[PDB]
Design a protein around this ligand. Sequence first.
Ligand SMILES: [Zn+2]
Ligand SMILES: [Zn+2]
Ligand SMILES: [Zn+2]
Lengths: 43, 99, 121, 81, 237, 161, 250, 105, 332
Amino acid sequence: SYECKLCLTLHNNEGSYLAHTQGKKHQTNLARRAAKEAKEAPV
Amino acid sequence: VWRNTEDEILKAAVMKYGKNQWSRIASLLHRKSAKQCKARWYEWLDPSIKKTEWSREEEEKLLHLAKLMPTQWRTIAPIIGRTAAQCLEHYEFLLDKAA
Amino acid sequence: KNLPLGWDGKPIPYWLYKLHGLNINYNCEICGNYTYRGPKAFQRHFAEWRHAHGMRCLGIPNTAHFANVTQIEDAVSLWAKLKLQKASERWQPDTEEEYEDSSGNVVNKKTYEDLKRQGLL
Amino acid sequence: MTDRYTIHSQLEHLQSKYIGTGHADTTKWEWLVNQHRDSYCSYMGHFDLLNYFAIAENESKARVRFNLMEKMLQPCGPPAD
Amino acid sequence: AHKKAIRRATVNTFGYIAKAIGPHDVLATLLNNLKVQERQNRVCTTVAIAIVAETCSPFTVLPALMNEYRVPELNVQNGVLKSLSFLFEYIGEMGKDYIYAVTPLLEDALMDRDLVHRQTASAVVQHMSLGVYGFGCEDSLNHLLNYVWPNVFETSPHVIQAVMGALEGLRVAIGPCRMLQYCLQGLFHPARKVRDVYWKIYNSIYIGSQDALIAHYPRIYNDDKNTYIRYELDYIL
Amino acid sequence: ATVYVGGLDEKVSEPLLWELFLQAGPVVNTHMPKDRVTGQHQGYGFVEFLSEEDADYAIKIMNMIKLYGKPIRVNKADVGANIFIGNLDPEIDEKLLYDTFSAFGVILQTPKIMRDPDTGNSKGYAFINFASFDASDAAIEAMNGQYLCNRPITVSYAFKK
Amino acid sequence: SKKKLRRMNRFTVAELKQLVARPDVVEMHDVTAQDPKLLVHLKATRNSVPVPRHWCFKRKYLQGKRGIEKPPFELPDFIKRTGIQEMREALQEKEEQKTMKSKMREKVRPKMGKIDIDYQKLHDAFFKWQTKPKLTIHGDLYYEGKEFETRLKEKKPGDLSDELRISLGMPVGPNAHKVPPPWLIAMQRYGPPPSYPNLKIPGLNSPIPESCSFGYHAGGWGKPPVDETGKPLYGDVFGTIDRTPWGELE
Amino acid sequence: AKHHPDLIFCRKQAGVAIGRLCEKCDGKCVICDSYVRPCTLVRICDECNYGSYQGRCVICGGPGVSDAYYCKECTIQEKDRDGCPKIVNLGSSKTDLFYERKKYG
Amino acid sequence: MFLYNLTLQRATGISFAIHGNFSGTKQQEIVVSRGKILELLRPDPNTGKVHTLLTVEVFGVIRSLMAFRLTGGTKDYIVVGSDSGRIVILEYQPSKNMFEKIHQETFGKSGCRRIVPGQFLAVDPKGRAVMISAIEKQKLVYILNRDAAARLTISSPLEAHKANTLVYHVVGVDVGFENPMFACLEMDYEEADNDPTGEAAANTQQTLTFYELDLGLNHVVRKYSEPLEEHGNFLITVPGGSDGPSGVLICSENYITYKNFGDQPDIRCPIPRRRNDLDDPERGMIFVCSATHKTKSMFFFLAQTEQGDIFKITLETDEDMVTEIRLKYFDT
RNA sequence: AUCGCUUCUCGGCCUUUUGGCUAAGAUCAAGUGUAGUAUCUGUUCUUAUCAGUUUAAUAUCUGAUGUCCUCUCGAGGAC
Ligand SMILES: [Zn+2]
Ligand SMILES: [Zn+2]
Ligand SMILES: [Zn+2]
């Protein structure tokens, strides 16, 4: 089966995985991580 | 009906196979035919279809047309740019908000 | 507001807060009347540093037996009875090991060696 | 509520057909009391704990038997209250 | 088929033709079926591997099962677990040679891969204990008790009654002392879910073998008003 | 009770670090608080071993400890700052030499005796980098001309290759 | 409230920790038990087994085990010896190369006896090469994350390892004893570490381990510590019944 | 039968009347629901053996044709010592399938 | 390490013994139970020596033993109640020298349990039923018959289960071809379980009760009960029918008491004491064993007391009601 | 040397992205019932004590939101 290494969810089918990525949970976690990386910017 | 899961599998299939091989795309889904896969893509899933709200230009159009060609929605629709089901529901909508 | 700070530097949901029971205040006196939020943190606190010091200052080792004791008088009293316990189960030869002299009467080995090298025994 | 008194049902059944079981509300007294009574009925079954006891004190097996069966009516004090 | 007579007979004839030909080829075509999706066919192939293994000795088909447990699908891992459940119940007393080969698989499954993994490894442990009862293969079973025991706080009907079956198999094979050393600390717990579970387990240890327990209870001191100590058991003689 | 693991070998894990701390004394914590991205140890690490004299003899033993081959430094938690030394004793060791000269500065080079490859005995010469140039001043001033192990020392700031 | 009368009965944790004979055993909620004196006495009985950690946890049990990825099961050695593994790998790759056409074709015209494995090797593997694994003693319950604990309580310096000595620049294998770790030099120099008065050094505080050599070239055991009289500094760096089993098979 | 939690046993005292199986039910155990190593025979309560109830399937209830046994596992855990194991209630599934059919055809 | 266990000296202590025509002849033999060993001895009438015809290992605890003889028959079978969950009926084959298992009836789980019958085993004198009983809450009654071929055939069990009642002893009362009757001692701990002071702990007293089969109706009814003055430990059947009265003697501490149901009053006679003995005067005295000797002429009961003193008991009777009890020292 | 050009050569790894025709060459994908669990998607909880319910504890749920006048839960004051 599949897992989202970011949101830490489990999925039975790949259809379920894709529907995950297009959903509130995945999108907001993705936005948070984008922010966090911006914070991480530097003779 | 159609579920988010079928829809995303369709989107992916189409984006790999192309829009004339509906029979193998229909082989990829369970409980789905090529007739139905095609209908769904060309009714809702196609990224050309726009799901916004009606500019009042679009609504004055809709009203003028739906009076000039009454009951002919597959003919009205392309002249304004949304599918026939959207045109039709939104037209009944204006009618009852006006009634 | 004052929500806990999340892993994304943001405040966590109010319902998650309620679930984790953070609003609940636990006083560690030995820690300088410190206060902890969350029973999780409170329980960790006995091996967390500030309590380690508090008990060092008290003179009572931060061992298992005193975990979940917070009042200092209680820690002291318990340390006393535990002193008595370990003292009981320990083996002190100096006090028990009973030695008979050549005169056939008994001393402990302490006095035995005492008056032994003290010119007599 | 539902699960509470339905497993209270099943456990009343178990116990009443099997003296000695327990439930989540079993007290120290009744636990140890059933444990004593079983101990006695088994000293009486087993022909050799009966010897051991009759020899350890200085009675006869019939008197020891009689004494056990006397004790078996309140082996651990009176009830809790 | 929808009829159970047909499936029972079908499994039997897999056994017979495995007796005629060797086991290997029929056993290979049977691990492939564990790759299907409808459960009734897979449960029936799981009984057919057990039968092949019991007719032609288990040492032929075990390495291939244990190896098939390494392919990454849910349904085939549960296929080989359920197959061992059946196999140990069939071979009965000859389990005592394969118990050591098997256990490292069961502890691996009892550290989760799924709810159903733990449910089916618990059934394997039940039948394996009832079979190896009496032959001193007891440290293995105790080691597996350490993995089966934490699943005691479950709520799925099937996982919880699989674990119960396992604990009562292990009661007869490990004896009631061990089982009581495991039940003791939670009979008077603060909570009540854990008292519920522990008293259910204790009742089932009590009902069967309630006499063997007289010798096993722990010493519980007497308080002010009642006398809780059994003194007859301290008479020396 | 706190010890700085510097030169902590890139892959020498907390297992090796605390297994060495435990083999010496009551290893109560080893930690490599590290680069929060690459995950590799920080080249600086904090290890608490409860006993002060344990930590002391641990630092005394863990100088030049070759984690992943490279000497790992355990202590209290390259501008040319080296001293070359003449009139050295061939009875000398590099760990003992770091223990001797290191009080004016830690060993940023392990004391290498400039000895031939033919026989393997010292030629009376050596070199080692201290921490600072002020450290070279102190070390070589308190060790200049004075009586070393067998041959009275002679040490000065480094001649470079 | 009679509930609050039962609460008025509820000892303080220090009350409990005082009365009972072993206080370590007492945890937080132990106070809330309708029989706290019993409960603690039963927690202090020998050989019994404590409740599983996760009864209070809000996440369920290995549902928490969730996140990371895991390597497939690892076969026992005595089963590897028989080579069933590579056999079944070969067939898996062949059948993954197969297509539906050829699959049905072999369903209808089997390749019988394509490959085989011999008996007597399966028989030796089960009845003559089997071994007892490492089992767990009574009471070691498993919990989420037990298998990612290296080990602990290993206070002994004599216990060396292979990765350790490798990334020490020291050899593992049969010459481990004759292989001195980087600690023995400063061990001979300034004693063992001063938490380990009671550790003995191989080659520095104890005799040379058999066939190892005192010396100062590459691979030796130094100049052994002694005083100015000739007495070793720690231990002896130079090395100054009928246990038969009773009823056993010949 | 260990499969359907909704059913119940007579549980009343044993007798001497051997127990009998219907042909659907033939061959399995009565509690363990196994198919193997049957060891001992079944004995049923006199009440649950009286009258029309003679010679029926303990489980099915139809016409008994063969004698019921207990698996060796039931015999070892002593689950054969509880008196009449006759299921005295029909269940949901019998009448359920029956009604689905009688609607269908 | 594997061991192998052999016995050298069988057990030699005796727990129960019964006597009867276990061979079928007019010889009387003895079946004793050593611990877990059943053996059959025969005393030779000429020399006075006892020969041990046979010894079997039964691999269980034997908790009780009865001999019983069908009506009109000539043998005695041995009913055995053990720590197993069954009652077994054995018949001796003197030709092959072995006990053979006539019947074996299961009713519960194995071990010396507390509500599972096996501890007490009473029979009824005319030989129509046995009753097996536990120390608490369970009694079964089996019925016994001949078939056409006059072989023993045993019914299904009846039941007498009653909650919260210890049982001290059970015995078959002698009645002639009426419904069989059994005479249980008893008690009821149900209230001392519920008396927070200790009042009902004392002042709860036994009650002798008679159970009665109903072979016409096939169930067991608890016909009579009545309390007993003080606690007594067992019960002797008084040979009824034509011979003698019927009923039971109850042997309580310091007393022996005839008792029967109907208008029959109760009778008591203290147990005689030794003149001028040195035993701590508070300790009481009870009977430990007994034995009925009944010949066509008379009957008399030998009873034995803790010190080992045997007494001979007779019952002076008018036609129906016994009028007195007459103890007489016999030996020690 | 540099600028312009010409030709050749070496390189990156890039770039490039496929068997012609025809009537898209033609055709086409058959389960269910009973009990139970899990996973995604979707939806949602700043409020304040205090009492009670309950709980292992939270929670939950239930309940009103020091005294007096007044200005507007807020404010001054004698207390
Ligand atoms: Zn049937
Ligand atoms: Zn069964
Ligand atoms: Zn019945």
